[PDB]
Design a binder for this molecule. Structure first.
Ligand code: CDL
Ligand code: CDL
Ligand code: BCL
Ligand code: BCL
Ligand code: BCL
Ligand code: BPH
Ligand code: U10
Ligand code: U10
Ligand code: QAK
Ligand code: FE
Lengths: 46, 306, 276, 247, 48, 46, 48, 48, 46, 48, 45, 47, 46, 48, 47
């Protein structure tokens, strides 16, 4: 499996991986925060 | 035959180019210069150097005075909160003066800041026009670029200055804002009849469409004959090669008539310049001369009485 | 009938269909089989428009109009006197455009140059087809196409625009307008630059591409080059039309016909960073 | 022009614009005719009077050049009006057929113009199209493939030669030509970059205009470090002929 | 060997990358267990 | 784990890290300040 | 090697980096303890 | 204080100073003329 | 006092000065014309 | 030096410049006296 | 001592100063936007 | 480094100071006149 | 403290300082002029 | 030797940097004490 | 590094510091005057 790095560049791919994961996490967090059940700051909305 | 000329295959890199020596009467340029790999994929890779003198520095200073006025008013309209500023930035504006003040100088919170920002932006734009003229003259070239810029400047002045003058009120001008100025465009069309029936508006739209049409055609033609050395448009006019012959024969066998390596750029210049000229004429006529364009169209047989 | 240098190019070959039967010129125009076909389609369409106008109340040029069928016919075929003429004129126009593009392809093959021009015309054909075929089908009936009139299709444009609140808030519409204005700016710049290099100041020799690079490095600090400006022109002119077609595809088929584009942007105003 | 009358200022202005636009169209179509006139009559027409069309071609135009010379357009000496072609039929509008070899006669898509037999001189009187071995300070941006060493294949998969140099354009930095050593000849020809796909097969250069065995026929340059405009145009036309005659 | 690396450097980077990715996955699993304990998802067809 | 520095230039890694951390802190502070339960300046609303 | 650093520089830079990262983490932990003592989060499905 | 003229060119500084001063002066005059108390041409606006 | 012309180019100075003077004059004239008291054409507004 | 002017040229230009400037100021002062005779400005806090 | 053999003091200082000024402006504006901490006009309503 | 000598530097500085002082004096006189025309800085209740 | 001038060109540093100070002063004056209490022209509002 | 500075110059610059940093933080601490003396923050969930 | 010696930098820094100090003095005087005209920092209820 380690041959992927013989095919891709580590420093050029790891940055895209980090950006991708950060964007995914921020999107999931915002979606959860926008609901009423899983809002963890102000709680549910009556 | 299979390589489309969209992207450069192999890039050549040398020393930076300082530039053609300037005609006496100008300051020296800057020396900072860099290269960009992505800009070289589509065009040229060298970035810089830049020339800044008196006109460019004064233009930037006045433009930033105007931008700062606009931005400080946008922050004051939101109680200086940066969070609420970022929340709704495209919905904020610096409104034109109120209709009850005519062409006088209104209070600051009712049109004075708008007038000062307009004045400084106009001075900035005029200084940039002077800069284009001056930079073109300092190399011995013609002044076609500045006289094309003058038409856009004329449309800008008609929108902001001339038509309010002829109407006798500063309130007829657009606001300084992203969405508010689109709303102003909509309300301007609604207020003076239907702007579709203004014939100079129709001509301006025709020239914008023809500008897009012609620039697509010219780009496609020059890319198609670039294998024979067609992109060197200046040398192909002083010494006609086979690339421009094929380019002319394509359009001659297609639509019956063709141009030369130079006259097509005159077609380009004129179709680009005629859009803001006809637009400015149509804007100056709207209000001072005609106040309902659909009634005008009905009078001249453009539409049934409806 | 030939230019002073044209004779060495009028060789035989490079057709797609028909062999050497239609491989001739009529004046300056090359013919091919697609030339015959496109002139045929154009003439049938013009005769049909004239016949539809004779059945109408006026011969006024600005008031001629070929109206699309009524919504009660769905996506079927309408009677000729109540909507079918619009459908047949649309068919004839599409045929004329496709045959024009194919004739351009034949001319490109005969001359030995790239196929960029028919490829770029295909974008305008795609926008027309989106306006008269794709969007009416996704909406449900042919009654959604625009009329063939000089001043009635402008009324169509305005009614369609006001059917979605204010059409200015359409984001693809905003991107397309930006591309159109940038295309105009770049055309003016390129024309003026080449003209000023070929017609210099009084008593000067004709300039060179180095002067052209220098003047824009002195104005704004960067110059794109001679091949870059043509690439960018094609790119901008095609992106404008692509995004206008997208703009019209999402209006109606995606956003409902009674909705508002200004209220879409509220997705930005309700972000939890600042919403409560 | 009074209030209530039919005539008003807007339509007067519109008609003024219509007249101006007719004038501008005439001026533009007049400028369009500075090359290729008068026309060459077809078969079965009179040749006693010239055909020019209704917007008459304007007077010749003179351009001042850098060294002090001048250039008068139209360029009538670039036309090459007498070539090896025969008409395929006696009626007007008929195509022509090459009587000999279209690769060597310069007809059809392989047609070139009679340009000046000198190199383009650049802003310091030194040729601009130059081999990289004679342009001090320029290199090939190692992020892109290095064509020097790759073999070149024709439209039929046959290898025609190998790449030995890259000719660049000074003052417009770009790779314009590749120098190709033919397979079994030790001779050098030029290949325009827009005609080649560098690295289409991983270690090769693909040219789908001519067959691999036709590189031997590409025209050559007089000097090994510079190329004239006529030679450039001939080298481009040779590859252009293969688009229709390579079979 | 077209990425500009050797085999040994590739193996080094791959080992470190695998261990880091594994630690990330373990922390994420613990976070999901805690999140389910705080408030569960996947309701029944009638609702919560 | 010191290996990463033979591959990544610290003079850009640290800049990216600092800009990203500052942006994240700004975002979280704004989110907290926009609520009513966690507004530490004007206090709760209504 | 590729970043232009030798082994010794890389190792000592890693050491100082880890130390500073650890100080940042412990300060953040203290800040979060204080924040919880001021205003707790993670309510119940019925609220606070 | 005279030594400063070895750092800055007198021409550039003296030509930018005049531009700055004129801009400031016209901005102040405009602000004064916008108000009602310091309008020196028409005087105070008619009170509503 | 003449020393100023050892710093400034007289041609540039005259161009700048003439443009500036004309612009300032036209601005003052327009401002005066916009008022009610100092309008010398049609006089005061009622 | 900076201007590339002979000192004699500088004094000549200065003389003619000062003459023109003084004539301009004189005629402007006459204009302002006539304008004040026509209508004074600078009203009182209540108006004219 | 910290090893400044890596970061040019010029750039790392000008960026630091610009950043600090921006942060301070943001904090002052945030405070001014509130009614409790407005130190110019005071509380609202 | 400005392309200036030292004597001419001091001369420029002298003339600069004199003209700066003249400007300042004229401005102070204008401000005295303006204040005796209309005072600014009102009271917290108004003028 | 004088060592700083070995690192910074006094020309650019001083002109940036002047621009920054003028901008800050303008911003403060604007904010003050925008309020009702500290408006020194036309005085307080109502 | 990457930055372009020596190793003693680095020590000197770092010493001055630390002194300035510390002075800044001291002034900021005093500012915050005064600000709290003017208006306390961090209210209770009931309010102030 | 910048283009200065070790002594000219000294005298430039001295002049810079004197100018900065006098500027600060003038600002302090202006602030005393402004507080005497219209104080700020009100109480939680207002002025
Ligand atoms: C109540 C008032 C009444 C008034 C009287 C009545 C009305 C009078 C109107 C008069 C209008 C202007 C007349 C003179 C124009 C001269 C143009 C010129 O010399 O062009 C040379 C130019 C050729 O130059 P070239 O050979 O390329 O270069 C020469 C040198 O190498 C390069 O030389 P260069 O580098 O020095 O110059 C470059 C060149 C570049 O080319 C041009 O500029 C020509 C196009 C001009 C466009 C003007 C745009 C104006 C925009 C608005 C105004 C500016 C606002 C903003 C100002 C700045 C703000 C900061 O620019 C010029 O030469 C012209 C500069 C001035 C332009 C503006 C003139 C107004 O001519 C053309 O390209 C063709 C011109 C168009 C001809 C079309 C055919 C005829 C059209 C009329 C038909 C009949 C109409 C009937 C109407 C209805 C009757 C009832
Ligand atoms: C309301 C609707 C508004 C839009 C209306 C659109 C109408 C489109 C009409 C399209 C067809 C036009 C054909 C003209 C051909 C003239 C003769 C010719 O070859 O000239 C070459 C000549 C170029 O070369 P040259 O050196 O200047 O002159 C060479 C000599 O002509 C000597 O050259 P040569 O020695 O090669 O001899 C040429 C001769 C060959 O010798 C022959 O005798 C050939 C046998 C046929 C003779 C008769 C041909 C047709 C005569 C005119 C018919 C006009 C009506 C066509 C049907 C219209 C149906 C609606 O004739 C031909 O090659 C004819 C070719 C077509 C058949 O001129 C052109 O190529 C002109 C092209 C014009 C394109 C159409 C532009 C239409 C207007 C566009 C804008 C519309 C705006 C509307 C706005 C409305 C309000 C919003
Ligand atoms: C209360 C109002 C009074 C009045 C009170 C005053 C007072 C007070 C003064 C004047 C002064 C002037 N008045 Mg008056 N004046 C009045 C009405 C007029 C009318 C009119 C038709 O109503 C006109 C034309 C004038 C004209 C004049 C000028 C003679 C003079 C302005 C000097 C100047 O312009 O410097 C311009 C000098 C130059 C060198 C400019 C050179 C031109 C440049 C180089 C070219 C620029 C190109 C340009 C941008 C191109 C586009 C221009 C457009 C095509 C127009 N007045 C009314 C009656 N007037 C002033 C004066 O006397 O000064 C001598 C003065 O102090
Ligand atoms: C509902 C709204 C109305 C309508 C209302 C208007 C109004 C109002 C106007 C137009 C105008 C135009 N309309 Mg319309 N228009 C409508 C429908 C259309 C449709 C369509 C398919 O429906 C199209 C294609 C168009 C297209 C057009 C163009 C032909 C024309 C714009 C020319 C231009 O390039 O200006 C763009 C160029 C400029 C504005 C000049 C640029 C100025 C300078 C050069 C820029 C300086 C930038 C500065 C340095 C940046 C810093 C500034 C600070 C940040 C602030 N309209 C409908 C019917 N339209 C304009 C016109 O002229 O028509 C008569 C115009 O005023
Ligand atoms: C109230 C109305 C709304 C509005 C409602 C609409 C509606 C509805 C539409 C647009 C569309 C457009 N609008 Mg809008 N739009 C408004 C305001 C504007 C303004 C402005 C300044 O306010 C601008 C610049 C625009 C600009 C635009 C463009 C993005 C777009 C038009 C280009 C296009 O479609 O290419 C497409 C080009 C073609 C289709 C050309 C086809 C070419 C064919 C193949 C060739 C024909 C040849 C012919 C038959 C033969 C000739 C031969 C002769 C011999 C010569 N709108 C107002 C606010 N707008 C249109 C769009 O985006 O559609 C894609 C559209 O449908
Ligand atoms: C033929 C008509 C079309 C046209 C033409 C046109 N525009 C032009 C020109 C021409 C021929 C120029 O020569 C001029 C230019 O410099 O182009 C590169 C310009 C220009 N058209 C511009 C914008 C513009 N043109 C528009 C439209 C159009 N321009 C028409 C469609 C629009 C629209 C649709 O709204 C805009 C926004 C500018 C990019 C430029 C004029 C710049 C100017 O006046 O700057 C004033 C300075 C300020 C406001 C200060 C703030 C700085 C920036 C916000 C301004 C841009 C500066 C940047 C362009 C250069 C900076 C370089 C630095 C190294 C200093
Ligand atoms: C309280 O409010 C305010 C704001 O907050 C709301 C602001 O934010 C700001 C703006 C400041 C900032 C916070 C941003 C930072 C910017 C700076 C630090 C720069 C500071 C700028 C100023 C203090 C003023 C700037 C003024 C400038 C640059 C010059 C202004 C010149 C004019 C207005 C021209 C006068 C008008 C005329 C003559 C009309 C004529 C008509 C024309 C349009 C043409 C004009 C052309 C010329 C006069 C020049 C021609 C030259 C030629 C031909 C070239 C000659 C050859 C040469 C090479 C010389 C301020 C000042 C402000 O107060
Ligand atoms: C608005 O008005 C109206 C018209 O609209 C202008 C109409 O018409 C019609 C009538 C139309 C219909 C009843 C059906 C309309 C349905 C659709 C448009 C839905 C979308 C359909 C598609 C996605 C495919 C569209 C294809 C169609 C319908 C073309 C019609 C075909 C024929 C008439 C048969 C003859 C074949 C032709 C002309 C083209 C066939 C269609 C293709 C898609 C071809 C695909 C081509 C390739 C895959 C590559 C081709 C390769 C080539 C050329 C080889 C080259 C050589 C090599 C060796 C490389 C009505 C009522 C109408 O009111
Ligand atoms: C008395 C006489 C003598 C004076 C009059 C002289 C006349 C001549 C004046 C005539 C004026 C006319 C001609 C102009 C009319 C203007 C219209 C034509 C066009 C309107 C512009 C439309 C744009 C979309 C504006 C958007 C700008 C805004 C979004 C940018 C805000 C910037 C902020 C964010 C600044 C960043 C934040 C901080 C706080 C750091 O700054
Ligand atoms: Fe071109």
């Amino acid at each position: 499996m380690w041959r992927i790095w013989l095919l891709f560049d580590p420093r050029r791919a790891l940055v895209l991986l980090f950006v991708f994961l950060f964007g995914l996490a921020i999107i999931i967090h915002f979606i959860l925060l926008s609901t009423s059940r899983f809002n963890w700051l102000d709680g549910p909305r009556a | 035959a299979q390589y489309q000329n969209i992207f450069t295959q192999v890039q050549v890199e040398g020393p930076a180019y300082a530039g053609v020596p300037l005609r006496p009467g100008s300051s020296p340029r800057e020396t900072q210069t860099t290269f960009n790999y992505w800009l070289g994929k589509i065009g040229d890779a060298q970035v810089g150097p830049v020339y800044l003198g008196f006109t460019g520095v004064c233009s930037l200073l006045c433009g930033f005075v105007a931008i700062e006025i606009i931005g400080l008013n946008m922050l004051a309209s939101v109680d200086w909160s940066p969070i609420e500023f970022l929340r709704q930035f495209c919905w904020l504006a610096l409104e034109p003066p109120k209709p009850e003040y005519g062409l006088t100088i209104p209070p600051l919170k009712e049109g004075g800041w708008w007038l000062m920002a307009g004045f400084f932006l106009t001075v900035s734009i005029a200084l940039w026009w002077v800069r284009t003229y001056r930079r073109s003259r300092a190399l011995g070239m013609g002044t076609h670029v500045s006289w094309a810029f003058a038409s856009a400047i004329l449309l800008y002045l008609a929108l902001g200055f001339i038509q309010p003058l002829l109407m006798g009120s500063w309130s007829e001008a657009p606001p300084f804002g992203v969405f508010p100025h689109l709303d102003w465009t909509n309300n301007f069309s609604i207020k003076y009849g239907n702007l579709y029936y203004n014939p100079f508006h129709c001509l301006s739209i025709a020239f914008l469409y023809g500008s897009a049409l012609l620039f697509a055609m010219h780009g496609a033609t020059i890319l198609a004959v670039s294998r024979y050395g067609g992109e060197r448009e200046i040398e192909q006019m002083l010494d006609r090669g086979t690339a421009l012959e094929r380019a002319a024969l394509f359009w001659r066998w297609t639509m019956g008539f063709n141009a030369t390596a130079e006259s097509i750029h005159r077609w380009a210049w004129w179709f680009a310049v005629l859009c803001p000229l006809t637009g400015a004429i149509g804007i100056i006529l709207t209000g001072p001369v005609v106040d309902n364009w659909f009634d005008w169209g009905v009078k001249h047989g453009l539409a049934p009485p409806r | 009938a030939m230019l002073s240098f044209e004779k060495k190019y009028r060789v035989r070959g490079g057709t797609l269909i028909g062999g050497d039967l239609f491989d001739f010129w009529v004046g300056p125009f090359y013919v091919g089989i697609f030339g015959v076909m496109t002139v045929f389609f154009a003439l049938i369409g013009i005769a049909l428009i004239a016949w539809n106008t004779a059945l109408g109340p006026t011969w006024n040029l600005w008031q001629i109009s070929v109206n699309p069928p009524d919504a009660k016919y769905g996506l079927g075929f309408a009677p000729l006197a109540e909507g079918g003429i619009w459908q047949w004129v649309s068919i004839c126009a599409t045929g004329a455009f496709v045959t024009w593009a194919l004739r351009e392809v034949e001319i490109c093959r005969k001359l030995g140059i790239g196929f960029h021009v028919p490829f770029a015309f295909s974008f305008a054909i795609f926008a027309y087809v989106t306006l008269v075929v794709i969007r009416p089908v996704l909406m449900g009936s042919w009654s959604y196409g625009f009329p063939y009139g000089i001043f009635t299709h402008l009324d169509w444009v305005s009614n369609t625009g006001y059917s979605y609140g204010q059409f200015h808030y359409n984001p693809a519409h905003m991107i397309a307008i930006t591309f159109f204005f940038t295309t105009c700016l770049a055309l003016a710049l390129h024309g003026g630059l080449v003209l000023s290099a070929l017609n210099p100041d009084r008593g000067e020799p004709v300039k060179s591409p180095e002067h052209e690079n220098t003047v824009f490095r002195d104005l704004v600090g960067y110059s794109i080059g001679t091949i870059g400006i043509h690439r960018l022109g094609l790119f901008l002119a095609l992106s404008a039309v692509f995004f206008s077609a997208v703009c019209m595809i999402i209006s109606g088929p995606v956003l409902a016909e009674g909705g508002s584009w200004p209220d879409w942007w509220n997705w930005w105003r309700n972000l939890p960073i600042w919403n409560p | 022009m009074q209030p209530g009358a039919y005539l008003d200022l807007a339509q007067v202005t519109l008609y003024v614009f219509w007249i101006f636009f007719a004038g501008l169209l005439f001026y533009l179509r007049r400028e369009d005719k500075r090359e290729g006139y008068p026309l060459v009559a077809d078969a079965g027409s009179g040749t006693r009077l010239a055909k020019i069309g209704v917007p008459a071609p304007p007077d010749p135009k003179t351009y001042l050049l850098r060294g002090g010379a001048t250039k008068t357009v139209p360029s009538t000496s670039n036309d090459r009006p007498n070539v090896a072609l025969t008409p395929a039929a006696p009626w007007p509008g008929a195509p022509f057929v090459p009587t000999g070899n279209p690769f060597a006669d310069g007809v059809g898509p392989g047609s070139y113009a009679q340009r000046a037999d000198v190199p383009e001189l650049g802003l310091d009187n030194l040729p601009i199209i130059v081999p990289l071995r004679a342009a001090k300070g320029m290199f090939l941006d190692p992020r892109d493939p290095n064509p020097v060493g790759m073999p070149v294949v024709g439209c039929d998969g046959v290898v025609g030669g190998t790449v030995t140099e890259v000719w660049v354009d000074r003052a417009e930095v770009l790779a314009r030509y590749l120098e190709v050593e033919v397979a079994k000849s030790r001779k050098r020809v030029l290949l325009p970059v827009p005609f080649a796909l560098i690295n289409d097969p991983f270690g090769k250069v693909s040219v789908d205009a001519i067959r691999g065995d036709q590189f031997a026929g590409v025209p050559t340059t007089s000097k090994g470090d510079q190329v004239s405009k006529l030679e450039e145009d001939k080298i481009c036309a040779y590859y252009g002929a293969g688009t229709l005659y390579a079979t | 060997s077209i990425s500009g690396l050797s085999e040994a450097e590739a193996k080094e980077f791959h080992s470190i990358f695998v261990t880091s990715f594994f630690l990330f996955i373990v922390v994420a699993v613990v976070a999901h267990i805690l999140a389910w304990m705080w408030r569960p998802w996947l309701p029944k067809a009638t609702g919560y």
